[PDB]
PDB file of C-alpha atoms and ligand atoms in Angstrom:
ATOM      1  CA  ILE A   1      20.911  80.772   6.357  1.00  0.00           C
ATOM      2  CA  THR A   2      17.961  78.203   5.657  1.00  0.00           C
ATOM      3  CA  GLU A   3      18.339  74.739   4.236  1.00  0.00           C
ATOM      4  CA  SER A   4      16.959  75.655   0.937  1.00  0.00           C
ATOM      5  CA  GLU A   5      19.268  78.710   0.851  1.00  0.00           C
ATOM      6  CA  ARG A   6      22.453  76.625   1.249  1.00  0.00           C
ATOM      7  CA  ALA A   7      21.259  74.017  -1.360  1.00  0.00           C
ATOM      8  CA  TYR A   8      20.622  76.900  -3.852  1.00  0.00           C
ATOM      9  CA  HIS A   9      24.276  78.155  -3.096  1.00  0.00           C
ATOM     10  CA  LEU A  10      25.705  74.538  -3.639  1.00  0.00           C
ATOM     11  CA  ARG A  11      23.868  74.395  -6.952  1.00  0.00           C
ATOM     12  CA  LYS A  12      25.595  77.747  -7.814  1.00  0.00           C
ATOM     13  CA  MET A  13      29.014  76.339  -6.646  1.00  0.00           C
ATOM     14  CA  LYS A  14      28.477  73.025  -8.848  1.00  0.00           C
ATOM     15  CA  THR A  15      27.602  74.880 -11.921  1.00  0.00           C
ATOM     16  CA  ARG A  16      30.876  76.979 -11.407  1.00  0.00           C
ATOM     17  CA  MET A  17      33.140  73.946 -10.980  1.00  0.00           C
ATOM     18  CA  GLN A  18      31.297  71.665 -13.660  1.00  0.00           C
ATOM     19  CA  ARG A  19      31.909  74.805 -16.247  1.00  0.00           C
ATOM     20  CA  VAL A  20      35.562  75.306 -15.086  1.00  0.00           C
ATOM     21  CA  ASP A  21      35.985  71.619 -15.530  1.00  0.00           C
ATOM     22  CA  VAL A  22      36.528  71.625 -19.483  1.00  0.00           C
ATOM     23  CA  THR A  23      38.506  68.679 -19.508  1.00  0.00           C
ATOM     24  CA  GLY A  24      35.691  66.748 -18.464  1.00  0.00           C
ATOM     25  CA  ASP A  25      37.522  64.353 -16.040  1.00  0.00           C
ATOM     26  CA  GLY A  26      35.461  65.348 -12.902  1.00  0.00           C
ATOM     27  CA  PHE A  27      38.565  67.613 -11.626  1.00  0.00           C
ATOM     28  CA  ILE A  28      39.613  70.931 -11.602  1.00  0.00           C
ATOM     29  CA  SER A  29      43.524  71.372 -12.665  1.00  0.00           C
ATOM     30  CA  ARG A  30      45.459  73.783 -14.305  1.00  0.00           C
ATOM     31  CA  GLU A  31      44.947  71.818 -17.562  1.00  0.00           C
ATOM     32  CA  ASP A  32      41.135  73.466 -17.286  1.00  0.00           C
ATOM     33  CA  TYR A  33      42.509  76.980 -17.256  1.00  0.00           C
ATOM     34  CA  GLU A  34      44.933  76.179 -20.175  1.00  0.00           C
ATOM     35  CA  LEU A  35      42.106  74.772 -22.147  1.00  0.00           C
ATOM     36  CA  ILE A  36      39.645  77.625 -21.715  1.00  0.00           C
ATOM     37  CA  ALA A  37      42.366  80.050 -23.025  1.00  0.00           C
ATOM     38  CA  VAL A  38      42.954  77.925 -26.049  1.00  0.00           C
ATOM     39  CA  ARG A  39      39.295  77.734 -26.697  1.00  0.00           C
ATOM     40  CA  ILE A  40      38.729  81.312 -25.993  1.00  0.00           C
ATOM     41  CA  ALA A  41      41.636  82.061 -28.711  1.00  0.00           C
ATOM     42  CA  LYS A  42      40.084  79.633 -31.351  1.00  0.00           C
ATOM     43  CA  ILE A  43      36.476  80.923 -30.653  1.00  0.00           C
ATOM     44  CA  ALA A  44      37.699  84.725 -30.682  1.00  0.00           C
ATOM     45  CA  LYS A  45      39.983  83.925 -33.675  1.00  0.00           C
ATOM     46  CA  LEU A  46      42.828  85.860 -31.494  1.00  0.00           C
ATOM     47  CA  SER A  47      46.223  86.054 -33.192  1.00  0.00           C
ATOM     48  CA  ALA A  48      49.185  83.959 -32.197  1.00  0.00           C
ATOM     49  CA  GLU A  49      50.503  86.965 -29.996  1.00  0.00           C
ATOM     50  CA  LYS A  50      47.314  87.617 -28.141  1.00  0.00           C
ATOM     51  CA  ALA A  51      46.633  83.771 -27.959  1.00  0.00           C
ATOM     52  CA  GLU A  52      49.670  83.049 -26.030  1.00  0.00           C
ATOM     53  CA  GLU A  53      49.444  86.242 -23.849  1.00  0.00           C
ATOM     54  CA  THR A  54      45.800  85.120 -23.019  1.00  0.00           C
ATOM     55  CA  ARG A  55      47.084  81.533 -22.173  1.00  0.00           C
ATOM     56  CA  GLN A  56      49.729  83.009 -19.762  1.00  0.00           C
ATOM     57  CA  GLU A  57      47.144  85.022 -18.008  1.00  0.00           C
ATOM     58  CA  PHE A  58      44.842  81.997 -17.388  1.00  0.00           C
ATOM     59  CA  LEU A  59      47.693  79.809 -16.061  1.00  0.00           C
ATOM     60  CA  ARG A  60      48.859  82.854 -13.854  1.00  0.00           C
ATOM     61  CA  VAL A  61      45.168  82.512 -12.438  1.00  0.00           C
ATOM     62  CA  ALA A  62      45.797  78.786 -11.914  1.00  0.00           C
ATOM     63  CA  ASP A  63      48.931  79.720 -10.246  1.00  0.00           C
ATOM     64  CA  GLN A  64      47.309  82.139  -7.949  1.00  0.00           C
ATOM     65  CA  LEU A  65      44.493  79.401  -7.036  1.00  0.00           C
ATOM     66  CA  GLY A  66      47.203  76.788  -6.254  1.00  0.00           C
ATOM     67  CA  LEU A  67      46.666  74.592  -9.166  1.00  0.00           C
ATOM     68  CA  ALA A  68      50.312  73.793  -9.751  1.00  0.00           C
ATOM     69  CA  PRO A  69      51.408  70.995 -12.096  1.00  0.00           C
ATOM     70  CA  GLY A  70      49.831  67.692 -10.807  1.00  0.00           C
ATOM     71  CA  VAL A  71      47.473  69.331  -8.447  1.00  0.00           C
ATOM     72  CA  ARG A  72      43.589  68.082  -9.078  1.00  0.00           C
ATOM     73  CA  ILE A  73      40.705  68.853  -6.905  1.00  0.00           C
ATOM     74  CA  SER A  74      37.551  66.956  -7.430  1.00  0.00           C
ATOM     75  CA  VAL A  75      34.524  69.066  -8.655  1.00  0.00           C
ATOM     76  CA  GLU A  76      32.492  67.802  -5.770  1.00  0.00           C
ATOM     77  CA  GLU A  77      35.071  68.918  -3.203  1.00  0.00           C
ATOM     78  CA  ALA A  78      35.706  72.040  -5.135  1.00  0.00           C
ATOM     79  CA  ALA A  79      32.028  72.962  -4.853  1.00  0.00           C
ATOM     80  CA  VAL A  80      31.391  71.648  -1.152  1.00  0.00           C
ATOM     81  CA  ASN A  81      34.414  73.747  -0.122  1.00  0.00           C
ATOM     82  CA  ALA A  82      33.316  76.854  -1.936  1.00  0.00           C
ATOM     83  CA  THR A  83      29.846  76.826  -0.506  1.00  0.00           C
ATOM     84  CA  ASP A  84      31.274  76.427   2.815  1.00  0.00           C
ATOM     85  CA  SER A  85      34.109  78.901   2.905  1.00  0.00           C
ATOM     86  CA  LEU A  86      32.048  81.573   0.932  1.00  0.00           C
ATOM     87  CA  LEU A  87      29.060  81.281   3.272  1.00  0.00           C
ATOM     88  CA  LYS A  88      31.355  81.654   6.557  1.00  0.00           C
ATOM     89  CA  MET A  89      32.583  85.120   5.273  1.00  0.00           C
ATOM     90  CA  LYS A  90      31.827  88.417   6.942  1.00  0.00           C
ATOM     91  CA  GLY A  91      31.796  91.858   5.234  1.00  0.00           C
ATOM     92  CA  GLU A  92      35.535  92.315   5.014  1.00  0.00           C
ATOM     93  CA  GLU A  93      36.365  89.184   3.495  1.00  0.00           C
ATOM     94  CA  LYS A  94      33.611  89.203   1.137  1.00  0.00           C
ATOM     95  CA  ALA A  95      34.617  92.700  -0.315  1.00  0.00           C
ATOM     96  CA  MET A  96      38.124  91.120  -0.870  1.00  0.00           C
ATOM     97  CA  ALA A  97      36.628  87.832  -2.428  1.00  0.00           C
ATOM     98  CA  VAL A  98      34.831  90.158  -4.825  1.00  0.00           C
ATOM     99  CA  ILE A  99      37.894  92.537  -5.872  1.00  0.00           C
ATOM    100  CA  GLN A 100      39.814  89.178  -6.201  1.00  0.00           C
ATOM    101  CA  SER A 101      37.380  87.860  -8.746  1.00  0.00           C
ATOM    102  CA  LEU A 102      38.147  90.729 -11.325  1.00  0.00           C
ATOM    103  CA  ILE A 103      41.294  88.841 -12.201  1.00  0.00           C
ATOM    104  CA  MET A 104      38.606  86.838 -14.015  1.00  0.00           C
ATOM    105  CA  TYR A 105      37.221  89.933 -15.792  1.00  0.00           C
ATOM    106  CA  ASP A 106      40.731  90.918 -16.953  1.00  0.00           C
ATOM    107  CA  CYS A 107      41.426  87.579 -18.618  1.00  0.00           C
ATOM    108  CA  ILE A 108      38.203  87.712 -20.511  1.00  0.00           C
ATOM    109  CA  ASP A 109      38.965  91.478 -21.642  1.00  0.00           C
ATOM    110  CA  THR A 110      41.474  89.879 -24.518  1.00  0.00           C
ATOM    111  CA  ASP A 111      41.753  93.257 -26.334  1.00  0.00           C
ATOM    112  CA  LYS A 112      42.588  94.945 -23.024  1.00  0.00           C
ATOM    113  CA  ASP A 113      40.394  97.849 -23.522  1.00  0.00           C
ATOM    114  CA  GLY A 114      39.327  97.564 -20.039  1.00  0.00           C
ATOM    115  CA  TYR A 115      35.736  96.526 -20.944  1.00  0.00           C
ATOM    116  CA  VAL A 116      34.226  93.094 -21.737  1.00  0.00           C
ATOM    117  CA  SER A 117      32.716  93.151 -25.112  1.00  0.00           C
ATOM    118  CA  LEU A 118      30.087  90.753 -26.448  1.00  0.00           C
ATOM    119  CA  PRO A 119      32.455  88.849 -28.486  1.00  0.00           C
ATOM    120  CA  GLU A 120      34.827  88.481 -25.525  1.00  0.00           C
ATOM    121  CA  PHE A 121      31.890  87.368 -22.951  1.00  0.00           C
ATOM    122  CA  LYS A 122      30.369  85.126 -25.610  1.00  0.00           C
ATOM    123  CA  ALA A 123      33.980  83.562 -26.207  1.00  0.00           C
ATOM    124  CA  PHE A 124      34.496  82.713 -22.595  1.00  0.00           C
ATOM    125  CA  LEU A 125      31.137  81.288 -21.809  1.00  0.00           C
ATOM    126  CA  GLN A 126      31.256  79.183 -24.934  1.00  0.00           C
ATOM    127  CA  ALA A 127      34.594  77.934 -23.858  1.00  0.00           C
ATOM    128  CA  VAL A 128      33.418  76.765 -20.523  1.00  0.00           C
ATOM    129  CA  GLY A 129      29.964  75.773 -21.949  1.00  0.00           C
ATOM    130  CA  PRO A 130      30.464  74.381 -25.264  1.00  0.00           C
ATOM    131  CA  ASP A 131      26.917  73.460 -25.277  1.00  0.00           C
ATOM    132  CA  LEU A 132      25.641  76.776 -24.803  1.00  0.00           C
ATOM    133  CA  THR A 133      23.884  78.460 -27.955  1.00  0.00           C
ATOM    134  CA  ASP A 134      24.847  81.794 -29.292  1.00  0.00           C
ATOM    135  CA  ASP A 135      21.388  82.999 -28.618  1.00  0.00           C
ATOM    136  CA  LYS A 136      21.718  82.044 -24.823  1.00  0.00           C
ATOM    137  CA  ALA A 137      25.146  83.384 -24.637  1.00  0.00           C
ATOM    138  CA  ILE A 138      23.655  86.619 -26.073  1.00  0.00           C
ATOM    139  CA  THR A 139      20.977  86.475 -23.353  1.00  0.00           C
ATOM    140  CA  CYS A 140      23.696  85.868 -20.367  1.00  0.00           C
ATOM    141  CA  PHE A 141      25.647  89.157 -21.840  1.00  0.00           C
ATOM    142  CA  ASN A 142      22.398  91.154 -22.097  1.00  0.00           C
ATOM    143  CA  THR A 143      21.899  90.021 -17.961  1.00  0.00           C
ATOM    144  CA  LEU A 144      25.193  91.502 -17.202  1.00  0.00           C
ATOM    145  CA  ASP A 145      24.826  94.567 -19.454  1.00  0.00           C
ATOM    146  CA  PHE A 146      22.551  96.518 -16.772  1.00  0.00           C
ATOM    147  CA  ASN A 147      22.830  99.643 -18.854  1.00  0.00           C
ATOM    148  CA  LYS A 148      22.307  98.016 -22.360  1.00  0.00           C
ATOM    149  CA  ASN A 149      25.152 100.085 -23.483  1.00  0.00           C
ATOM    150  CA  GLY A 150      26.706  97.043 -25.494  1.00  0.00           C
ATOM    151  CA  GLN A 151      29.678  96.406 -23.111  1.00  0.00           C
ATOM    152  CA  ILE A 152      30.038  94.819 -19.459  1.00  0.00           C
ATOM    153  CA  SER A 153      32.011  97.278 -17.492  1.00  0.00           C
ATOM    154  CA  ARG A 154      33.841  96.276 -14.359  1.00  0.00           C
ATOM    155  CA  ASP A 155      31.137  97.640 -11.894  1.00  0.00           C
ATOM    156  CA  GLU A 156      28.466  95.513 -13.758  1.00  0.00           C
ATOM    157  CA  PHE A 157      30.633  92.421 -13.721  1.00  0.00           C
ATOM    158  CA  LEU A 158      31.432  93.324  -9.656  1.00  0.00           C
ATOM    159  CA  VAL A 159      27.970  93.531  -8.695  1.00  0.00           C
ATOM    160  CA  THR A 160      27.162  90.146 -10.825  1.00  0.00           C
ATOM    161  CA  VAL A 161      30.100  88.450  -8.846  1.00  0.00           C
ATOM    162  CA  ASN A 162      28.929  89.429  -5.556  1.00  0.00           C
ATOM    163  CA  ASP A 163      25.333  88.113  -6.080  1.00  0.00           C
ATOM    164  CA  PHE A 164      26.938  84.954  -7.672  1.00  0.00           C
ATOM    165  CA  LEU A 165      29.344  84.386  -4.786  1.00  0.00           C
ATOM    166  CA  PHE A 166      27.049  85.331  -1.921  1.00  0.00           C
ATOM    167  CA  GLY A 167      23.669  85.400  -2.863  1.00  0.00           C
ATOM    168  CA  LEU A 168      21.326  83.026  -1.083  1.00  0.00           C
ATOM    169  CA  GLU A 169      17.902  83.111  -3.624  1.00  0.00           C
ATOM    170  CA  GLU A 170      17.420  82.531  -7.261  1.00  0.00           C
ATOM    171  CA  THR A 171      18.303  85.559  -9.730  1.00  0.00           C
ATOM    172  CA  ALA A 172      18.795  86.138 -13.443  1.00  0.00           C
ATOM    173  CA  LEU A 173      22.259  87.452 -12.587  1.00  0.00           C
ATOM    174  CA  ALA A 174      23.322  84.241 -11.366  1.00  0.00           C
ATOM    175  CA  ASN A 175      22.002  82.134 -14.142  1.00  0.00           C
ATOM    176  CA  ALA A 176      23.671  84.395 -16.472  1.00  0.00           C
ATOM    177  CA  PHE A 177      27.072  84.230 -14.847  1.00  0.00           C
ATOM    178  CA  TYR A 178      28.231  80.817 -16.430  1.00  0.00           C
ATOM    179  CA  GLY A 179      25.428  80.639 -17.367  1.00  0.00           C
ATOM    180  CA  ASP A 180      22.300  78.512 -16.835  1.00  0.00           C
ATOM    181  CA  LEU A 181      22.357  76.446 -13.332  1.00  0.00           C
TER     182      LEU A 181
HETATM  183 CA1   CA B   1      39.203  68.899 -15.443  1.00  0.00          CA
HETATM  184 CA1   CA B   2      37.765  94.275 -24.176  1.00  0.00          CA
HETATM  185 CA1   CA B   3      27.137  98.278 -19.758  1.00  0.00          CA
END
């Protein structure tokens, strides 16, 4: 792994943590996960029943990540610890990290039809990136939609996640993920 490779990977990890920090305090906490769910519910005009299910799902992810009440990790620490951890992983641990990431797929799938639609992916991207234009969100969606069938399936999401977490050189995939480093 080169110095340029490591720096690229850190840029990706910084993008991830800055996008997740929707509260804008320079930390990652369960408040961030809750706000992303709340914003998705507004953007996607979810019913009150679906909005609460989605809020609970995001908080469950916060719980799985260890973001208990009062726990806050700086975006700087989060990003550094991510590049360090992920770049040390061998094959079996990589595979598990990728499967684990699919919990985020399920969160974004708010109608639970097992696919991520354009509305669902757009709601997610604009929840974490309020500055991202409708056009750019569509571009990001089209990047993940490998077969151009109008939905992001779990296979498409998974191969994208793998490149985002472990990729060492620039791709359109990694840019669409959050998207825009
Ligand atoms: Ca935050
Ligand atoms: Ca769906
Ligand atoms: Ca597709």
